[PDB]
Design a protein around this motif. Structure first.
Motif, mmCIF file in Angstrom:
data_model
loop_
_atom_site.group_PDB
_atom_site.id
_atom_site.type_symbol
_atom_site.label_atom_id
_atom_site.label_comp_id
_atom_site.label_asym_id
_atom_site.label_seq_id
_atom_site.Cartn_x
_atom_site.Cartn_y
_atom_site.Cartn_z
ATOM 1 N N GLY A 16 -5.432 -3.741 -6.117
ATOM 2 C CA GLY A 16 -5.599 -3.312 -7.620
ATOM 3 C C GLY A 16 -4.643 -4.106 -8.473
ATOM 4 N N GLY A 17 -3.692 -4.021 -8.660
ATOM 5 C CA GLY A 17 -2.848 -4.487 -9.717
ATOM 6 C C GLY A 17 -1.908 -5.673 -8.774
ATOM 7 N N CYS A 18 -1.077 -6.183 -9.641
ATOM 8 C CA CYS A 18 -0.595 -7.556 -9.051
ATOM 9 C C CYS A 18 -1.563 -8.777 -8.833
ATOM 10 C CB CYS A 18 0.346 -7.275 -7.717
ATOM 11 S SG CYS A 18 1.530 -6.016 -7.983
ATOM 12 N N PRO A 31 9.542 -3.114 -4.379
ATOM 13 C CA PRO A 31 9.702 -1.876 -3.697
ATOM 14 C C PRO A 31 8.655 -1.521 -2.729
ATOM 15 C CG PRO A 31 9.882 -1.953 -6.158
ATOM 16 C CD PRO A 31 9.323 -3.197 -5.954
ATOM 17 N N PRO A 32 9.109 -0.827 -1.990
ATOM 18 C CA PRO A 32 8.373 -0.258 -0.808
ATOM 19 C C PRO A 32 7.026 0.200 -1.438
ATOM 20 C CG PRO A 32 10.478 0.314 -0.140
ATOM 21 C CD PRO A 32 10.399 -0.010 -1.500
ATOM 22 N N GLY A 33 5.899 -0.049 -0.561
ATOM 23 C CA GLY A 33 4.688 0.584 -1.048
ATOM 24 C C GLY A 33 3.824 -0.026 -2.321
ATOM 25 N N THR A 34 4.123 -1.394 -2.591
ATOM 26 C CA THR A 34 3.577 -2.142 -3.495
ATOM 27 C C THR A 34 2.428 -3.042 -3.040
ATOM 28 O OG1 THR A 34 5.337 -3.900 -3.384
ATOM 29 C CG2 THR A 34 5.555 -1.868 -4.857
ATOM 30 N N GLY A 35 2.060 -3.144 -1.779
ATOM 31 C CA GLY A 35 0.986 -4.116 -1.224
ATOM 32 C C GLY A 35 1.633 -5.468 -0.635
ATOM 33 N N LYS A 36 2.864 -5.489 -0.403
ATOM 34 C CA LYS A 36 3.130 -6.645 0.364
ATOM 35 C C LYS A 36 2.425 -7.147 1.743
ATOM 36 C CE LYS A 36 7.736 -5.751 0.346
ATOM 37 N NZ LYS A 36 7.992 -4.400 -0.293
ATOM 38 N N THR A 37 2.286 -6.008 2.550
ATOM 39 C CA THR A 37 1.657 -6.374 3.737
ATOM 40 C C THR A 37 -0.015 -6.325 3.312
ATOM 41 O OG1 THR A 37 3.081 -5.305 4.878
ATOM 42 C CG2 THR A 37 1.050 -5.692 5.961
ATOM 43 N N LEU A 56 -4.203 2.297 -12.914
ATOM 44 C CA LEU A 56 -5.805 2.699 -12.816
ATOM 45 C C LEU A 56 -6.748 2.001 -11.673
ATOM 46 C CD1 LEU A 56 -7.929 4.095 -14.293
ATOM 47 C CD2 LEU A 56 -8.171 2.437 -16.015
ATOM 48 N N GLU A 57 -6.238 0.656 -11.764
ATOM 49 C CA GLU A 57 -7.122 -0.199 -10.864
ATOM 50 C C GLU A 57 -7.004 0.380 -9.549
ATOM 51 O OE1 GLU A 57 -9.661 -2.856 -11.094
ATOM 52 O OE2 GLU A 57 -9.454 -2.366 -13.323
ATOM 53 N N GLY A 78 1.746 1.611 -5.482
ATOM 54 C CA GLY A 78 0.380 1.950 -5.050
ATOM 55 C C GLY A 78 0.428 2.756 -3.787
ATOM 56 N N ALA A 79 1.217 2.804 -3.032
ATOM 57 C CA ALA A 79 1.289 3.895 -1.770
ATOM 58 C C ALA A 79 1.578 5.140 -2.416
ATOM 59 C CB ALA A 79 2.540 3.525 -0.825
ATOM 60 N N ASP A 80 2.186 5.632 -3.558
ATOM 61 C CA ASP A 80 2.308 6.770 -4.157
ATOM 62 C C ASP A 80 0.697 7.104 -4.737
ATOM 63 O OD1 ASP A 80 5.119 7.615 -4.132
ATOM 64 O OD2 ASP A 80 5.561 6.040 -5.169
ATOM 65 N N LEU A 81 0.094 6.206 -5.102
ATOM 66 C CA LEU A 81 -1.144 6.654 -5.946
ATOM 67 C C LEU A 81 -2.238 6.791 -4.597
ATOM 68 C CD1 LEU A 81 -1.449 3.830 -8.667
ATOM 69 C CD2 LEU A 81 -0.956 6.397 -9.108
ATOM 70 N N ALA A 82 -1.966 6.244 -3.767
ATOM 71 C CA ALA A 82 -2.870 6.588 -2.402
ATOM 72 C C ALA A 82 -2.768 7.711 -2.075
ATOM 73 C CB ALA A 82 -2.439 5.340 -1.218
ATOM 74 N N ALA A 83 -1.410 8.164 -1.689
ATOM 75 C CA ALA A 83 -1.079 9.621 -1.394
ATOM 76 C C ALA A 83 -1.474 10.586 -2.308
ATOM 77 C CB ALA A 83 0.489 9.345 -1.380
ATOM 78 N N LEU A 84 -1.450 10.123 -3.554
ATOM 79 C CA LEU A 84 -2.010 11.215 -4.770
ATOM 80 C C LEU A 84 -3.693 11.438 -4.401
ATOM 81 C CD1 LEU A 84 -1.901 12.903 -7.508
ATOM 82 C CD2 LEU A 84 -2.327 10.620 -8.482
ATOM 83 N N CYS A 85 -4.479 10.183 -4.077
ATOM 84 C CA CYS A 85 -5.735 10.395 -3.982
ATOM 85 C C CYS A 85 -5.846 11.293 -2.729
ATOM 86 C CB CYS A 85 -6.360 9.073 -3.873
ATOM 87 S SG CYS A 85 -6.542 8.297 -5.302
ATOM 88 N N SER A 86 -5.321 10.966 -1.571
ATOM 89 C CA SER A 86 -5.401 11.885 -0.414
ATOM 90 C C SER A 86 -5.256 13.371 -0.365
ATOM 91 C CB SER A 86 -4.587 11.237 0.767
ATOM 92 O OG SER A 86 -5.002 10.025 0.865
#
Ligand SMILES: Nc1ncnc2c1ncn2[C@@H]1O[C@H](COP(=O)(O)OP(=O)(O)O)[C@@H](O)[C@H]1O
Ligand SMILES: Nc1ncnc2c1ncn2[C@@H]1O[C@H](COP(=O)(O)OP(=O)(O)O)[C@@H](O)[C@H]1O
Ligand SMILES: Nc1ncnc2c1ncn2[C@@H]1O[C@H](COP(=O)(O)OP(=O)(O)O)[C@@H](O)[C@H]1O
Lengths: 721, 39, 474
Positions: free
Chosen positions: A185-187, A224-230, A356-357, A386-394
């Motif tokens: 999404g972002g970045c 930070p962790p959970g930002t999509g580096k991997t 949002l993305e 991003g890892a927080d927003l993914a957890a939010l959706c789950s």
């Protein structure tokens, strides 16, 4: 002849491809015509061509589904031809893929294929793969048999069949649920920068080995962790086709002496054998942390082994090593020297737009109710990654599931597709999950892309022009600055009453200039002062450099002066730990980095004069309270999209609000709207904001800047001449 | 031909649904109406 | 190299290091180059491991064995001479040192020319302009800059010709020219690795850039040039050269330019220490860094070491109010110590500057320190004319501009204030030029309009402060 480069698409529709207008006329097709695309291995696809204003003249924009059907990848070249004689089909037989329908049972046609094909007029060819999302799954299908050949358009009277066993996936056919560029999404600015660095040597290895220009060999990602580096590292490898080898700290560190060194070396040997290849090392700080932070012999040796393996990349042609860390200075500085990991990309944290993305991406398979507002969530989820927003959706999904499952009581090994397909997640489920979620980056620095335009700022017409001269002209017309020997200013300070748009001016100029915006607030400068951590000032300016072009906005410059007594002060001078580091970074920053420093204060009389010397914030702009014509402009800007009634006299209101700031005029506009809405709901227990609603708002709004403050600001501005 | 023209109408309609001021203003009022209804 | 030796196990690192010396002797004459020396023999205070202590001893014995290994020379590379075991630098072993430093604008141009020898450049490419923009870069970064600019030019053509084969056509590459836009793009992507390092170079400021102060210019030549241009006269008359001079006076009068201009004419390296750096050492209690500054000055000799804003700490302590202590503090005491231990035979000259001489620790003014004092007043009428013309030396000033008139009017303006007028008039000319495309020279109207905003920065209250002090010194 008619050979175009394959690029990424914005339109998510699998049957739609976009071409730039000049090709619509050279190929002599009308908007919405049906064309065939020629790919690899004598394969082709049929799709509908639309035009837009974003496609490059020589490129075709298509999504992953179309590229996989053509067995092509981004950057390749395909041929396009019209086929205007396509007719309707009467029979289309579609079966699911065995690797995507598992653990689920029900009528796949009613859930997936019916809404996909019914009155959809999709061009379909035998052998096409397509994806239908829903029921919290991503289920892909293959077309196996049609009466017409080799392609047709599905009609409202077409019979869709689905009889037989699931299809076994071919080993050369990649699943549509694999990580690609459309999962990020972002970045996006960082992803684009990386693609430019790596896709060329990976897609065209014959180019680099035949010329004198050497490719990059290593890229360090951090944030930070959970930002999509991997996620990025996987998307790049999967989209280019390079062999992907995964390394992580714990896997190597858990091994004994003599095993960790051999396993790390093997990873490099395997990548060469499978070159072109990408080696991704996650948690790099766990393998090669700064040497000053380790005491063991094994940890020092494995650092030396990594350094020698990275240097061996002079022989391991077409192997690129990417690594992920939290901070660029948490690892052995040797890794970042010429060669090895000499490229750096700061992934950081997505802003409100990026968030949002991400929410939209991780809800693609979710059925959302009409009350769900992901933009409102994105604005509230400050400090989330991003890892927080993914957890939010789950979490929201699981809450919705529990509510229905406890009522239907259907217990079996598989889940009914119809039950999940009709399960909607409401705002109560996202609100519940949002209250439970806890941001992982609550106090991190976030680089944002400004959304403020000049049309959002009322009045100050002369300031808008002045800022363009200070920020745009030095780079839009560099030949005039060289001709006249002019040295561009490095920054400007705003002063004046609060609520007059000082921050908006910085954002608006950053927006028009297509520059990033960084906001530093008073409490952060106070934290650095009190905690004796003024070294963190370098991190602020370092991000400004790497994020360039950007505008670095320092708010509340006087926050420390006030903490030191303000008007009384103490036994020392104006200098302190934090301002000294800020001034040092400013002096060491060149205008060639396209970084413009902007400050603001409501108490300019107590700003250390050093920051106003030539080379620093030498330019001073006074932002007074809006005048009669500006206050009307402010009201119009705040009401630009509001249903304002014809009886509203905005000039009369502006004449009354003589002592009001722009911030106070906004409250009046917002209150008047809310009052009109209140009346609307009351009539059911109205279509426009009436004069009475603005006049009523006038009885609740107050001026924030008193006459005593106006004289103080005016006298100060007069003193400055 | 005419079968492609019906596919053209479907492709253009999906593009407009994905791109889509009136629904943002109505949704912002709807949210404020429910809050005033219960307060 | 360090990593190659350190990655080996105990008993393998010592053996491999010994073999390297034996092979060099067998193939003598030979040179052994040890890169990342700090990775093999770091300062002992930083390591306690049994293996690391032993490999240091093994290197020391192998270096001493060079008395028998005839014609073998060992060279090593480190980042700092003080990062390695001091034993290595004792008589013998590694008893010679060479300071490579960072290339200046001239050296950077030479590097860019070398790494472009094989590249076809377009007529719009100006490598000298690039060398001036690439501040803080080292050769490794300029090589990366040329690579990125070359790759950009390649990408733009390759995506258009679409020739994919095992080999590349020579004609395709031979006709590919790299334009200035590709270098400018690469400059935006490149990030200097040595941007925060101390910059030591001969300044480009000359005497023609300084208006007025004719007698100060001559005085500096007597203090800085004569002790080395005519040393036989100083010996003849028993004269002891001064070690440094302190400048005082209003701000914006050219005190910094004076120090740079004399360093330039003398072809000496200029080292600039600024107020914020003295304050950083004071606040962080890291005054030890002063010793490294004076040691670098010796390494770069002949040089001029300029301490600006010498009063920055005294002001940070309250200045006009102050505190319960005296003038001495951590940072100035280290400066005083280093100056006392510095000999005039190293050709290092110290210059200070302050805007508040009344609060400078008097110790710095004693014989052996900054014993000379020069007052820099606000410019007079003839100097203001020279200042305006010097600041406009490179500007396309129209013939209708009367710079002598402006000097006659701007009686209370400092040199820095006259520059604001010059730069403001230039900005106005730029605005007019840009508007004409939606002009060839700066017109009288641009200077007269600039005068609407320009003001004097130094008031009479502060001028008297300097006059009273200057009179006190007689
Ligand atoms: N920018 C982003 N866009 C989409 N998803 C993201 C983004 N950043 C993070 N995520 C999601 O968050 C998770 C990140 O996990 P991972 O990539 O393994 O991170 P880490 O390297 O910290 O272990 C994934 O589920 C991924 O989909
Ligand atoms: N000139 C202006 N035009 C339109 N709105 C304004 C203006 N000045 C202030 N506002 C309103 O005031 C609010 C605060 O503005 P901001 O620039 O954040 O103030 P400050 O710079 O004092 O923090 C904004 O949301 C905006 O709606
Ligand atoms: N005598 C002078 N001749 C020419 N320019 C001067 C003179 N004095 C001051 N200036 C201008 O003022 C600016 C600041 O001078 P500088 O020596 O940096 O002041 P300071 O020593 O107080 O830092 C310079 O850029 C220069 O253009």
């Amino acid at each position: 002849p008619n050979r175009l480069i394959v690029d990424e698409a914005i339109n998510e529709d699998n049957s739609v491809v976009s071409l730039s207008q000049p090709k619509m006329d050279e190929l002599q097709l009308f908007r919405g015509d049906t064309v065939l695309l020629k790919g690899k291995k004598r394969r082709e696809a049929v799709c509908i061509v639309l035009s837009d204003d974003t496609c490059s003249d020589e490129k075709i924009r298509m999504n992953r589904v179309v590229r996989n059907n053509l067995r092509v990848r981004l950057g390749d070249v395909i041929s396009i031809q019209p086929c205007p004689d396509v007719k309707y089909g009467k029979r289309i037989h579609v079966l699911p893929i065995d690797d995507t329908v598992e653990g689920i049972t029900g009528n796949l046609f009613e859930v997936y294929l019916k809404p996909y094909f019914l009155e959809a007029y999709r061009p379909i060819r035998k052998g096409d793969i397509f994806l239908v999302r829903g029921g919290m799954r991503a289920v892909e299908f293959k077309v196996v048999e049609t009466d017409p050949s080799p392609y047709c358009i599905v009609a409202p009277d077409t019979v869709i069949h689905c009889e037989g066993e699931p299809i076994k996936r071919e080993d050369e056919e990649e699943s549509l649920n694999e990580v690609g560029y459309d999962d990020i999404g972002g970045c996006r600015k960082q992803l684009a920068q990386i693609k430019e660095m790596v896709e060329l040597p990976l897609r065209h290895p014959a180019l680099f080995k035949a010329i004198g220009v050497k490719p990059p060999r290593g890229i360090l990602l951090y944030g930070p962790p959970g930002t999509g580096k991997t996620l990025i590292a996987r998307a790049v490898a999967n989209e280019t086709g390079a062999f992907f080898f995964l390394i992580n700290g714990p896997e190597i560190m858990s091994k004994l002496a003599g095993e960790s060194e051999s396993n790390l070396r093997k990873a490099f040997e395997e990548a060469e054998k499978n070159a072109p290849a990408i080696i991704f090392i996650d948690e790099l700080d766990a393998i090669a942390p700064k040497r000053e932070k380790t005491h063991g012999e094994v940890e020092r040796r494995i650092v030396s082994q990594l350094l020698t393996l990275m240097d061996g990349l002079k022989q391991r042609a077409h192997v690129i090593v990417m690594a992920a860390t939290n901070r660029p200075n948490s690892i052995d500085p040797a890794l970042r020297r010429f060669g090895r990991f000499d490229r750096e990309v700061d992934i950081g944290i997505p802003d409100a737009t990026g968030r949002l993305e991400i929410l939209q991406i991780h809800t693609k398979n979710m059925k959302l109710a009409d009350d769900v507002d992901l933009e409102q969530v994105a604005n509230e989820t400050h400090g989330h990654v991003g890892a927080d927003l993914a957890a939010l959706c789950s979490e929201a999904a699981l809450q919705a599931i529990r509510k229905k499952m406890d009522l239907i009581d259907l217990e079996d090994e598989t889940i009914d597709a119809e039950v999940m397909n009709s399960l909607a997640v409401t705002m109560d489920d996202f609100r519940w999950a949002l209250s439970q979620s806890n941001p992982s980056a609550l106090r991190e620095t976030v680089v944002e892309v400004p959304q403020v335009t000049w049309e959002d700022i009322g009045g100050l017409e002369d300031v808008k022009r002045e800022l363009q001269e200070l920020v745009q002209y030095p780079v839009e017309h560099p030949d005039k600055f060289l001709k006249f020997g002019m040295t561009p200013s490095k920054g400007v300070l705003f002063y004046g009453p609060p609520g007059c748009g000082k921050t908006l001016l910085a954002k608006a100029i950053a927006n028009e200039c297509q520059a990033n915006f960084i906001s530093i607030k008073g409490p952060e400068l106070l934290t650095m002062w009190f905690g004796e951590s003024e070294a963190n000032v370098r991190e602020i300016f370092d991000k400004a450099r790497q994020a360039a072009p950007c505008v670095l906005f320092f708010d509340e410059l006087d926050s420390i002066a006030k903490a030191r007594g303000g008007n009384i002060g103490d036994g020392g001078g104006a200098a302190d730990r934090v301002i000294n580091q800020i001034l040092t970074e400013m002096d060491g920053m060149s205008t060639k980095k396209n970084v413009f420093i902007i400050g603001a204060t409501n108490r300019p009389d107590i700003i250390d004069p050093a920051i106003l010397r030539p080379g620093r914030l030498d330019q001073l702009i006074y932002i007074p309270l809006p005048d009669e014509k500006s206050r009307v402009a402010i009201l119009k800007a705040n009401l630009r999209k509001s249903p304002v009634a014809k009886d509203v006299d905005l000039e009369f209101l502006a004449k009354m609000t003589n002592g009001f700031s722009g911030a106070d005029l906004t409250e009046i506009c917002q209150r008047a709207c809310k009052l009109a809405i209140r009346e609307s709901i009351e009539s059911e227990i109205v279509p426009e904001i009436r004069r009475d609603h603005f006049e009523e708002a006038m009885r609740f709004a107050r001026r924030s800047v008193s006459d005593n403050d106006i004289r103080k600001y005016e006298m100060f501005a007069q003193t400055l001449q | 031909t005419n079968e492609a023209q019906m596919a053209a109408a479907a492709a253009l309609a999906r593009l407009e649904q994905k791109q889509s001021s009136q629904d943002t203003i109505r949704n912002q009022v709807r949210k404020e109406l429910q809050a005033e209804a219960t307060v």
